[PDB]
Nucleic acid binder design. Structure first.
Lengths: 72, 72
RNA sequence: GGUAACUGUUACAGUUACC
RNA sequence: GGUAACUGUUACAGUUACC
């Protein structure tokens, strides 16, 4: 495995989750929803490529984002 | 102006800031950096289109994202 | 050679915001 | 009519990870 590849995937998963919360609350525009849809399919492909569960990678991405923000 | 368009831009700006932090810590892979570069140009275009300052929009996206995560 | 995601460019169709 | 960003499809060239 490549460490930064996994880290990038986990963070992309968590940032997708944040974006989805915005859409769910009716706070986003249509192109934003278009990107959500396309990125969801892309993250499924990357997760299969890396052999990583998406739910678990999202939780790991949350920890990574919180740590780099705590260090900012 | 359209409220969800502005909100979408503010949030995209703040998430770009988070991604940039990961890259400045050399924790990302090359495609992640390619996306960062492309999205920085795109956000400059959207900010010009909306007449919005990117630094301010980034701070406003931070508040929106924190408010959403707080109510999750 | 293959799988996956992406970047630059190209052609067509479209969505949104604004003028 | 235009500006901006994007989505789907297409063509070419690359980047990365893994096999």
């Amino acid at each position: 495995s490549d460490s930064n590849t996994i880290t990038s995937f986990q963070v992309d998963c968590y940032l997708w989750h944040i974006r989805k919360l915005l859409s769910m609350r009716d706070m986003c525009d249509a192109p934003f929803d278009d990107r959500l849809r396309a990125d969801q399919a892309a993250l499924k492909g990357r997760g299969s490529t890396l052999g990583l569960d998406l739910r678990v990678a999202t939780m790991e991405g949350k920890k990574i984002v919180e740590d780099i923000l705590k260090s900012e």
